[PDB]
Write a protein that binds this DNA or RNA. Sequence first.
RNA 1: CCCGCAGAAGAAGCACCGGCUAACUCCGUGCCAGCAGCCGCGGUAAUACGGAGGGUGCAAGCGUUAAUCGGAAUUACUGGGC
RNA 2: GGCCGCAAGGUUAAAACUCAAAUGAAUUGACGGGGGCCCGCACAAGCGGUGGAGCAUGUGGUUUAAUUCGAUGCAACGCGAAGAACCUUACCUGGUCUUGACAUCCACGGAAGUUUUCAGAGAUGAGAAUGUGCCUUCGGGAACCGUGAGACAGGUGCUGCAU
RNA 3: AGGGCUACACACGUGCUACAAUGGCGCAUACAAAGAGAAGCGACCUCGCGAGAGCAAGCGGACCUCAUAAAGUGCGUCGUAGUCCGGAUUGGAGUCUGCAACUCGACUCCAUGAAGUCGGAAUCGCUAGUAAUCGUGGAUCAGAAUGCCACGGUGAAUACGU
RNA 4: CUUACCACUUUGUGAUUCAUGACUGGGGUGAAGUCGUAACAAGGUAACCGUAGGGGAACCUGCGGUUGGAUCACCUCCUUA
RNA 5: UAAGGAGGUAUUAAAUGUGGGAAUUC
RNA 6: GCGGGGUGGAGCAGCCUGGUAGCUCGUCGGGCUCAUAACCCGAAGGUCGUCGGUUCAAAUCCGGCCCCCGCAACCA
RNA 7: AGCCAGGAUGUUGGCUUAGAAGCAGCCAUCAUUUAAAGAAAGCGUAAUAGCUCACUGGUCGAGUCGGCCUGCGCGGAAGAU
RNA 8: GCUCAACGGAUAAAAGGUACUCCGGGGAUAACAGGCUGAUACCGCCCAAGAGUUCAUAUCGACGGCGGUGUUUGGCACCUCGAUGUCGGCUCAUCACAUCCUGGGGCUGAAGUAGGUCCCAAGGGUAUGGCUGUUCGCCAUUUAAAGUGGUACGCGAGCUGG
Lengths: 59, 122
Amino acid sequence: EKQAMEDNKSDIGWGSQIRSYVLDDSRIKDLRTGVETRNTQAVLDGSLDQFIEASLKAG
Amino acid sequence: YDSADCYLDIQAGSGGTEAQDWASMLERMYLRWAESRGFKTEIIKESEGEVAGIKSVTIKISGDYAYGWLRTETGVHRLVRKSPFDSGGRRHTSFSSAFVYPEVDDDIDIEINPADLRIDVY
RNA sequence: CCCGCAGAAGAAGCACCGGCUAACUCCGUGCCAGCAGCCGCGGUAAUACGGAGGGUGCAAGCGUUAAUCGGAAUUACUGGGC
RNA sequence: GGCCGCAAGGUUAAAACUCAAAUGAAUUGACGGGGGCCCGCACAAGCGGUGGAGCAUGUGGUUUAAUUCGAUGCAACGCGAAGAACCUUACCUGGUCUUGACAUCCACGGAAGUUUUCAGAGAUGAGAAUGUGCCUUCGGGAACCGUGAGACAGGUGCUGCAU
RNA sequence: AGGGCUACACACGUGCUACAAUGGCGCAUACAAAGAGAAGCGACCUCGCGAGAGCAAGCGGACCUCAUAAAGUGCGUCGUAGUCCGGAUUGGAGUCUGCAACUCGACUCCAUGAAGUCGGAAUCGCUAGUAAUCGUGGAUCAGAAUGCCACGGUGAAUACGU
RNA sequence: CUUACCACUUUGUGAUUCAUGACUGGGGUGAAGUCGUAACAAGGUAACCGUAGGGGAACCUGCGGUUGGAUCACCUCCUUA
RNA sequence: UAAGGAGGUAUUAAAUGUGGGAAUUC
RNA sequence: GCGGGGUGGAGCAGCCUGGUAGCUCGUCGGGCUCAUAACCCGAAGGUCGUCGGUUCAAAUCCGGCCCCCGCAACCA
RNA sequence: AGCCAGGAUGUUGGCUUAGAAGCAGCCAUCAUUUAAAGAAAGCGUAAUAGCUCACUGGUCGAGUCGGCCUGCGCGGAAGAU
RNA sequence: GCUCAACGGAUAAAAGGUACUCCGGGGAUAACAGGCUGAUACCGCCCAAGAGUUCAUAUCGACGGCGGUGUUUGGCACCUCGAUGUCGGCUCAUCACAUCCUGGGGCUGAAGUAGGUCCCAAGGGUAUGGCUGUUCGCCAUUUAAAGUGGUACGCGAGCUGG
Ligand SMILES: [K+]
Ligand SMILES: [K+]
Ligand SMILES: [K+]
Ligand SMILES: [K+]
Ligand SMILES: [K+]
Ligand SMILES: [K+]
Ligand SMILES: [K+]
Ligand SMILES: [K+]
Ligand SMILES: [K+]
Ligand SMILES: [K+]
Ligand SMILES: [K+]
Ligand SMILES: [K+]
Ligand SMILES: [K+]
Ligand SMILES: [K+]
Ligand SMILES: [K+]
Ligand SMILES: [K+]
Ligand SMILES: [K+]
Ligand SMILES: [K+]
Ligand SMILES: [K+]
Ligand SMILES: [K+]
Ligand SMILES: [K+]
Ligand SMILES: [K+]
Ligand SMILES: [K+]
Ligand SMILES: [K+]
Ligand SMILES: [K+]
Ligand SMILES: [K+]
Ligand SMILES: [K+]
Ligand SMILES: [Mg+2]
Ligand SMILES: [Mg+2]
Ligand SMILES: [Mg+2]
Ligand SMILES: [Mg+2]
Ligand SMILES: [Mg+2]
Ligand SMILES: [Mg+2]
Ligand SMILES: [Mg+2]
Ligand SMILES: [Mg+2]
Ligand SMILES: [Mg+2]
Ligand SMILES: [Mg+2]
Ligand SMILES: [Mg+2]
Ligand SMILES: [Mg+2]
Ligand SMILES: [Mg+2]
Ligand SMILES: [Mg+2]
Ligand SMILES: [Mg+2]
Ligand SMILES: [Mg+2]
Ligand SMILES: [Mg+2]
Ligand SMILES: [Mg+2]
Ligand SMILES: [Mg+2]
Ligand SMILES: [Mg+2]
Ligand SMILES: [Mg+2]
Ligand SMILES: [Mg+2]
Ligand SMILES: [Mg+2]
Ligand SMILES: [Mg+2]
Ligand SMILES: [Mg+2]
Ligand SMILES: [Mg+2]
Ligand SMILES: [Mg+2]
Ligand SMILES: [Mg+2]
Ligand SMILES: [Mg+2]
Ligand SMILES: [Mg+2]
Ligand SMILES: [Mg+2]
Ligand SMILES: [Mg+2]
Ligand SMILES: [Mg+2]
Ligand SMILES: [Mg+2]
Ligand SMILES: [Mg+2]
Ligand SMILES: [Mg+2]
Ligand SMILES: [Mg+2]
Ligand SMILES: [Mg+2]
Ligand SMILES: [Mg+2]
Ligand SMILES: [Mg+2]
Ligand SMILES: [Mg+2]
Ligand SMILES: [Mg+2]
Ligand SMILES: [Mg+2]
Ligand SMILES: [Mg+2]
Ligand SMILES: [Mg+2]
Ligand SMILES: [Mg+2]
Ligand SMILES: [Mg+2]
Ligand SMILES: [Mg+2]
């Protein structure tokens, strides 16, 4: 079962991403929910509640 | 299992040293978010990249519905910036993976029921 | 084949527009979606993706694929080299 | 695979797959633990320091409601700041406003003002006295205060990798 | 309006002050330059141990004020001690600016009296009126410099050579 | 009717070709991993070729060969014109 | 001044640097 | 059955013979470097498997219990 | 003992439950109608329902109940000529 | 003057192999079988927490308790060491019942079919092959079924001899 989880794990590569943090454009976007923010500093300091709540609401 | 405590594993990916730095940044972010939520964190283990950052880290998060709150963060996180390592300062992309799995109780040992065994002597 | 009748009345699409190669802008998108014969294009100000307007080339066809030769003097007899 | 060899191996000699290059000579640089010649508190020769202590100050990190923002090898770190109790201040908490603190236009009112009262942490809200002038075809108008719209204002918000 | 920018297990840079006798302290007494000043500089005199206060000249200044330069020199003392070194920290009492010094000002008086006895690896500046050391002024500025900018005093060592 | 020839068909043993096979050899590739740093400068022991031995690996060493290797300055002494 | 011969010079040490560059072009 | 072991994060000493924990790497801080390694200068970290006894006093001596090792386990 | 009546009310006591009505439990567990009728002892229903029963009246007319000590017996009690 | 500590001390002085073996003895004494025992083994029963939607007892049954057999592995050392030959197979069996099939029955969480479980019943019946010396076991394919045991783990003056 553990090996199945490892095989299931997305390759940590160029196509697989749940959230994109572009600092030059000063944008952070969650691919799954579409939630986008511009306060990269706040998100890097720990303001993940927006994305987490959006994902839980989306279910 | 949403109510259970959880473990968070961060692993560096394509960026190499930049990815290791990005993984360290992700670890800091997640620790800060846990502190905001009032959960208790303990670094189970932490492999550090030689030049910078961390190659990997396992963190234990304890609290009310910690796995519920954290489970949606499972995935690969893409980072785009001006590589603070590239001599030319080119705009690069780096990847780091966060994997959250719930804390699991150890399995209760069961004695082999003698009625389930057939013994032959010869 | 010819004569008469009726009314513009029944009859236009396909590919392409970064270079090669004739034909350019806006919006969407943001290394995603996608394109791609070659070089390549797309990572938030794309004439290269998709739509639109405009334009170019063909036309009851227009493109794609398959196949042969040409260009290939890239087997050189014509007509090459070490 | 064949032939040769005691063997090592030699000889002859492919294909699938993959790339849009691989390559030769020369040119301009850059580089060399290549050469030569010069120079610089670069060594050498000295003198005094820093790193140890206390304090000042900046930064990082951490903390925090906020500890505002930038600079962050040499070429950031007594740097922007030639001077944060309030103001500054860009940050936080709370209390407040929505053509508006700062402009122009339109309409409508009111001189400008000045003095007070009360309540509020203050913003502000409510009230009371007191002046009602200056140009002036008694058409006025406009210095200035408000009120009502909507074109607008406003942002020390993002990108120094558009400038 | 109030709070923060001043937080504080810690790490680094740049400074100031020291660890003493080529010095500390007390008394006396020489020699500068540069600059600022009107909501300013403020004399004098009086009061206060003092920071300062009251009254009040002069000066938009080669005129008046800031404003005795200090190191030095002379005399005396301390006699190598964590000291008559050091002056952090803390308690009490005040002054001034400013509506307002709690968070978070500067200064004064009294009491206190920490580390520190010359600093590991390493590392910096300087070739002459320089380094070193000693005072002075300015901007910013209501108040708030060990920072910055500038000005003088004293004043070296060494450079064989590449 | 019989004999000869001969198709189907049968047996044995080879050859060749295709597919396949536990396992195994190397090859190519890769927007990051591990170990070094082999070459390119005299690449820090010049490199390379043939061969042999050795070694986690690039490689190391011996023997012979090639140049498709860099540098070749400076001080002192002696002699001659 | 030129030519020739000989002797001395000399660093022990020094591994590594992923993955997103060029308008300037009738 | 008979022998051994169990000590900073790892590998080994210290037990015998009671009083006292060491070495190498690793970790942490400061250097060097453009940066990392190497290197240099400093630090920290084990109450000795677990209980018990004995002792003025136990890593040390004794006894259990747990783990790990070896051997032995025969004629039959 | 049988046998004949009866064997009520608030009230399905409420919660938790999927439903829970005496009868999954949890959980209270009372008063009223009185001859007596349990917030139920059992059966039963998915739940009710239903069936009892405890309780109590009426006819029949002598025993009846269930413990203690003790004597002797019964089952438990399957093997290979 | 002796750890002559094997401590009433063989000598001042001493270890092993024999499956190449040999002699005298012992059922005083082991290996097989018999015996005694029954820890263990196998088979029953008692209590009933619980499982079984409800419901302990259709089927199971925890924590505990009481027996039966001789039947595994043992304990002991009574028989046999002037000899009681052994595993498996083959041939031939014979008994038990704790019944595998067929026969009869009860309950069932038994609609039927097909089962579960227990009771009665021993008349008859109750595989062939692959592997292995095998017993055992696994596997293939059958059968109504491929029983469990005792018999010196029946049976070598019947065979075999892996
Ligand atoms: K856009
Ligand atoms: K030719
Ligand atoms: K040979
Ligand atoms: K050069
Ligand atoms: K310093
Ligand atoms: K203050
Ligand atoms: K610029
Ligand atoms: K300072
Ligand atoms: K003192
Ligand atoms: K001032
Ligand atoms: K293969
Ligand atoms: K080499
Ligand atoms: K070379
Ligand atoms: K090896
Ligand atoms: K003896
Ligand atoms: K012997
Ligand atoms: K032998
Ligand atoms: K026997
Ligand atoms: K017996
Ligand atoms: K018994
Ligand atoms: K015998
Ligand atoms: K039967
Ligand atoms: K039956
Ligand atoms: K029978
Ligand atoms: K076996
Ligand atoms: K038998
Ligand atoms: K016999
Ligand atoms: Mg064209
Ligand atoms: Mg662009
Ligand atoms: Mg666009
Ligand atoms: Mg297009
Ligand atoms: Mg074609
Ligand atoms: Mg041709
Ligand atoms: Mg050619
Ligand atoms: Mg061959
Ligand atoms: Mg020097
Ligand atoms: Mg210091
Ligand atoms: Mg900052
Ligand atoms: Mg900014
Ligand atoms: Mg403020
Ligand atoms: Mg720039
Ligand atoms: Mg600050
Ligand atoms: Mg001034
Ligand atoms: Mg003093
Ligand atoms: Mg001291
Ligand atoms: Mg002293
Ligand atoms: Mg100079
Ligand atoms: Mg000075
Ligand atoms: Mg090399
Ligand atoms: Mg080399
Ligand atoms: Mg070698
Ligand atoms: Mg590496
Ligand atoms: Mg590179
Ligand atoms: Mg001890
Ligand atoms: Mg033997
Ligand atoms: Mg009896
Ligand atoms: Mg004796
Ligand atoms: Mg033999
Ligand atoms: Mg022999
Ligand atoms: Mg004998
Ligand atoms: Mg006997
Ligand atoms: Mg026996
Ligand atoms: Mg026996
Ligand atoms: Mg006896
Ligand atoms: Mg006998
Ligand atoms: Mg006899
Ligand atoms: Mg029977
Ligand atoms: Mg019979
Ligand atoms: Mg009969
Ligand atoms: Mg066989
Ligand atoms: Mg027997
Ligand atoms: Mg038998
Ligand atoms: Mg027998
Ligand atoms: Mg016999
Ligand atoms: Mg044999």
